[PDB]
């Protein structure tokens, strides 16, 4: 299957960039209970990143200009973001590493979904320990070029550590590598890490040798949280980024802008998303559908609790096709939700992945409207 090809099933992003009179501060209290953010993602079934961050869209010119042969992806769990860039930039190779419980062979499911084959991904972290595959251990770092001798040029990290200590750990072990790394150091200093970062506390100083170049507010992440990627180089550090900064940013996009619909709709993976919410659930859903998957509760503990799963599912779907077609927005999503009656009973019921597969499915819902 042809990379390419296989990059309109993804959405445009919408991001802001800060490059490193009183301001003012933006406010807006979207009353929403729902992760609205995955509204687009219904084309992608165990991982979504891609949606949310892009290569080719916020660091473009750095990919152009650096020209890498090899990306480095750390914390990439299914591996959404990688495939994305695999259809971006169709000549680039792979290193993968992610935190791993056991020794068992794991490959990046949504990357092997996208692209068809693992021969681009040429270190899969494949017999890697535990510790060897935590960004936070010194034992992660010495074993990355234990396939690719090619310097660590972008590494990109999406790893959701537990605490904030975790983020430090990683980057003062990705900057010990790059100063003492026999590959890295023939390089230079010209050496990026584009990581998540969860914008709490201001002047927070990042460690001794590492300047934020810019900082990265996307459109596809939680509106209550504080998350950003930021651009990350050797040099006189600086401070990292601060909640007030960041809420401006992910206030003005939420505000202003709209989510972008994917150009092609991947129908498999549509069914797949519909059957991972309410197992039986075919495409299209409508009226007709709805009225299926109310009939087959009828025919009839854990039996009463599943079928209320499946009536508050099916409620909400209604809902949703007896809703009027508006714009993928906050303001829009405010209404969907301040319009259904039982939005407690919802969140009550359905747990996370549920409601996150739910988004999915009311996202291609209201983009397959008129
Ligand atoms: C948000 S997911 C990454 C999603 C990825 N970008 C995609 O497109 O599928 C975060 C991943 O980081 C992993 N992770 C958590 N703590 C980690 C650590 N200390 N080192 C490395 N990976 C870690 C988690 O296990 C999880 O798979
Ligand atoms: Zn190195």
């Avoid at 709490?200 to 934020?212: A, E, G, Q, T």
């Avoid at 550090?237 to 401006?248: F, R």
Wanted: charge should be positive.
């Amino acid at each position: 299957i042809d990379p390419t090809e296989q990059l309109a099933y993804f959405p445009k992003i919408t991001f802001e960039r800060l490059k490193n009179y009183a301001k003012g501060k933006l406010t807006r209290n979207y009353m929403i209970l729902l992760p609205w953010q995955h509204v687009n993602r219904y084309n992608f079934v165990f991982s979504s990143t891609g949606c949310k961050v892009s290569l080719k869209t916020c660091i473009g010119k750095l990919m152009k200009d650096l020209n890498p042969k090899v990306l480095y992806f750390i914390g990439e769990g299914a591996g959404n973001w990688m495939a994305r860039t695999a259809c971006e930039y169709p000549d680039i190779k792979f290193v993968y590493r992610s935190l791993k419980d056991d020794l068992d062979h794991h490959y990046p499911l949504e990357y092997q979904r996208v692209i068809g084959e693992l021969s681009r991904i040429i270190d899969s972290g494949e017999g890697l320990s535990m510790e060897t595959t935590d960004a936070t251990q010194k034992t992660h770092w010495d074993l990355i070029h234990r396939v690719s001798k090619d310097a660590l040029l972008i590494t990109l990290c999406d790893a959701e550590f537990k605490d904030r200590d975790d983020f430090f750990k990683m980057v003062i072990l990705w900057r010990k590598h790059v100063l003492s790394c026999r590959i890295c150091t023939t390089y230079g200093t010209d050496l990026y890490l584009f990581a998540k970062y969860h914008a709490k506390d201001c002047n927070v100083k990042l460690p001794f040798f590492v300047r934020s170049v810019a900082t990265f507010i996307m459109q596809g992440s939680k509106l209550s949280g504080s998350e950003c990627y930021i651009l990350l180089t050797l040099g006189h550090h600086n401070n990292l980024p601060c909640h007030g900064e960041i809420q401006n940013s992910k206030m003005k996009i939420a505000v202003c802008n709209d989510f972008y619909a994917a150009k092609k709709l991947d129908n498999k993976s549509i069914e797949a998303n519909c059957k991972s919410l309410l197992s039986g659930l075919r495409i299209p859903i409508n009226k007709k559908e709805l009225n299926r998957q109310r009939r087959l509760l009828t025919l009839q503990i854990e039996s009463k609790w599943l079928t209320n799963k499946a009536n508050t599912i099916i409620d909400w779907l209604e809902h949703i096709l007896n809703s009027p077609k508006g714009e993928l927005n906050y303001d829009f999503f405010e209404a969907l939700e301040n319009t259904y009656p039982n939005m407690i009973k919802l969140i009550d019921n359905l747990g996370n992945a549920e409601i996150k597969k739910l988004i999915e499915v009311t996202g291609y819902m209201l983009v397959s409207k008129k």
